[PDB]
Design a protein around this ligand. Structure first.
Ligand SMILES: Nc1nc2c(ncn2[C@@H]2O[C@H](COP(=O)(O)O[C@@H]3[C@H](O)[C@@H](COP(=O)(O)OP(=O)(O)OP(=O)(O)O)O[C@H]3n3cnc4c(=O)[nH]c(N)nc43)[C@@H](O)[C@H]2O)c(=O)[nH]1
Ligand SMILES: Nc1nc2c(ncn2[C@@H]2O[C@H](COP(=O)(O)O[C@@H]3[C@H](O)[C@@H](COP(=O)(O)OP(=O)(O)OP(=O)(O)O)O[C@H]3n3cnc4c(=O)[nH]c(N)nc43)[C@@H](O)[C@H]2O)c(=O)[nH]1
Ligand SMILES: [Mn+2]
Ligand SMILES: [Mn+2]
Ligand SMILES: [Mn+2]
Ligand SMILES: [Mn+2]
Ligand SMILES: [Zn+2]
Ligand SMILES: [Zn+2]
Lengths: 362, 361
């Protein structure tokens, strides 16, 4: 099957008219719901879209039926208090609450409450999707702890769009990330330095392990940095550019994400796995094999296979480090049953062992 | 499959380049629209005609230039065919209901194209002046042209033609009676319902013996053309996820790019345009209707068959409008012989020497 994976890729490659019309309507809903948030004298007044990539590039590495957009808000200087043992989850206080700043509305004691803030955010969003009648869009019901306000756009069929509130901090990145982003031998030290001068983001995802200061915790997000890595992924500056050579890095990612996606459809036993796991694993793969020659389109089968083997080893050692927070083990026993890891390993091996019958979709 | 496949490969732009130009153009358009929709304008109710999104770049045309059409539904129309051109018309109103803004641009019974295009131009110009979000400007007006051309420059320059388009829901003009000859290709039910849709009038003035006729309009079927381009096969699944690929759009994109580059080097080629190539491939898709005659493996023979057909069009000075068969885009009166022989010789040269114009690496 040296070219069977290309057949999968080509069948996946979607209607450029499906991309445009869907990206245009998701855009319109977002760009107007954004515009209508900045003119409402709420606390989110100064909100902006964070540049994390369009629906256009999204479909090339992920499933078209599910999208996400991040609304960033810059907040006065804040101090981060590490919430327990991940280096990813935080309680947030203001170093000093500027007078008349309406974000004080959301405090729960001294800490900025992700729940209070996300609840009003949800309220304003819900309140303007209701005036939207140019498009068929509804707000799906609340799943607790989730950072998203999920829109369901069904102009013809259904596309869920997560709207994610993001606090933006221009200060130095938190110390749990200090040896994260190990791109020095791949994208290099000047790149790493300039990415770590960018802001970082906090999304209202609560951690689930405490004495009722859980509803106030936030989680670090590096979506903007991840966009950069995904689009600037070669050691050569012209990798996958018009005047440079193609690599199969992104193709391997699309294939891995499509494989997880089809497995997750058949087996609710796979509920705990998610695209971020696969994306995290390929970041490590790209660090380990940083040479563009190690990702030759002609070697797609081998490259895909070494990503599968790497992922399988993460499952078996129950270790998959967050690429930006080496402390944070996404595959720890606290988070994913060992029986679920073993289940996914079984299914992946089976597909690996038998020429990927699940891609048998002609 | 020698280099055409690779020519197409490097021609493909990446979807952030697309995303960015598309969102830029669309946001300049979207709000050029959203404000014209305001009060006091004779143009309110203007909508955007779906003639296509940025995927114009997308394997059929050049990302350099783009065009959008702003459609305006008008009351019932009387069209008086200008001379017997078939494409050019005088637009009369049966009568106007009270409160219709379009009465401003009336001359007796004649909706003046020039006078309507003029303050269309005026309001657009007065509005691109009001956004500093993007660098956008309005190039000098060209006489007879139907466009107001936006010059967009975020980083690099994209010119967007905004073309006003009257929408009429009446029957298509008699000049189109034997146009759209798709019956052996997309079929008679398709032809029927396509001709049940509205048709459009853009302010392109006709060119006669004495001078530009300031108030004539020209028929446009850009909406129908977008349908055909995207629904181009005899099999309903052609180029769909559960059907087979063809190379029709690839041939169109190769041909447009050849004309583009040839025009880039020789000023003798200023008479020829994008719509000539499109019209040629429409007839070509009519002559060779079946999807097997456009298999992607036979790309080079398909391309060469289109080049041969276009050459035959050049030498014979015959390229009928696909919708208006008595309108000859390659007539004597529109393009002189010198221009056709020039183009023909360049095309034969590139064709026999394996397209040297195409060298990139
Ligand atoms: N993106 C991200 N995710 C991180 C990070 N550190 C830890 N995580 C955790 O990994 C998964 C990611 O879930 P995904 O499905 O891949 O992405 C989610 C999801 O689509 C919605 C809702 O978030 P969720 O946490 O509620 O998702 P569930 O799968 O239902 O898991 P559960 O614990 O609640 O039950 O939003 C996406 N999403 C979450 N966070 C982000 C984000 O930061 N940026 C973007 N663009 N999308 C996000 C999750 O458990 C996540 O918490 C990390 O650094 N980045
Ligand atoms: N698209 C179209 N064009 C038609 C039709 N019937 C007759 N024509 C004539 O063919 C050319 C089209 O030239 P293009 O460059 O391919 O498209 C034009 C052009 O880019 C601008 C300005 O119009 P223009 O005619 O003034 O441009 P020039 O290249 O300088 O030609 P010239 O004769 O004046 O010297 O707008 C485009 N454009 C014109 N008309 C349309 C239209 O109806 N729809 C769309 N999307 N774009 C249009 C022209 O001479 C054209 O009039 C026909 O049915 N369709
Ligand atoms: Mn959730
Ligand atoms: Mn979820
Ligand atoms: Mn012109
Ligand atoms: Mn022109
Ligand atoms: Zn690459
Ligand atoms: Zn096709």
């Amino acid at each position: 099957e040296p070219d069977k994976l290309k057949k999968v890729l080509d069948k996946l490659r979607l209607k450029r008219k499906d991309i445009s019309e869907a990206a245009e309507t998701v855009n319109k809903v977002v760009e107007r719901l954004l515009r209508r948030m900045q003119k409402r004298e709420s606390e989110f007044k100064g909100v902006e879209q964070l540049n994390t990539g369009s629906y256009y590039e999204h479909v090339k590495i992920s499933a078209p039926n599910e999208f996400d957009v991040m609304f960033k808000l810059e907040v006065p200087r804040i101090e981060l208090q590490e919430y327990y043992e991940t280096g990813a989850f935080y309680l947030v206080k203001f170093k000093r609450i500027p007078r008349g700043n309406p974000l004080s509305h959301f405090l729960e004691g001294e800490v900025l409450s992700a729940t209070k803030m996300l609840s009003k955010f949800r309220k304003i969003i819900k309140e303007e999707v209701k005036e939207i009648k140019d498009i068929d869009v509804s707000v799906e019901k609340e799943k607790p702890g989730s950072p998203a306000v999920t829109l369901l756009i069904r102009n013809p069929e259904e596309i869920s769009v997560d709207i994610i509130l993001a606090l933006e901090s221009k200060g130095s990145w938190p110390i749990s990330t200090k040896e994260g982003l190990p791109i020095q031998g791949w994208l290099g030290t000047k790149v790493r330095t300039n990415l770590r001068r960018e802001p970082f983001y906090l999304v209202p995802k609560n951690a689930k392990d405490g004495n009722s200061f859980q509803g106030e915790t936030w989680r670090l997000s590096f979506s903007h940095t991840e966009k950069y890595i995904l689009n600037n992924h070669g050691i050569e500056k012209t990798c996958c550019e018009s005047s440079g050579a193609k690599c199969c890095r992104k193709e391997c990612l699309k294939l891995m994400k499509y494989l997880l996606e089809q497995l997750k459809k058949e087996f609710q036993e796979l509920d705990a796995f998610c695209s971020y796991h696969v994306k995290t694993a390929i970041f490590h793969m790209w660090t380990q094999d940083p040479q563009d020659s190690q990702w030759d389109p002609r070697n797609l089968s081998s490259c895909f296979d070494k990503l599968l083997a790497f992922f399988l080893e993460c499952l078996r050692t129950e270790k998959l480090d967050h690429y930006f927070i080496p402390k944070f083990n996404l595959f720890s026993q606290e988070l994913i049953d060992r029986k679920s890891k073993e289940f996914l390993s079984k299914k992946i091996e089976y597909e690996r062992n038998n020429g990927f019958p699940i891609f048998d979709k002609l």
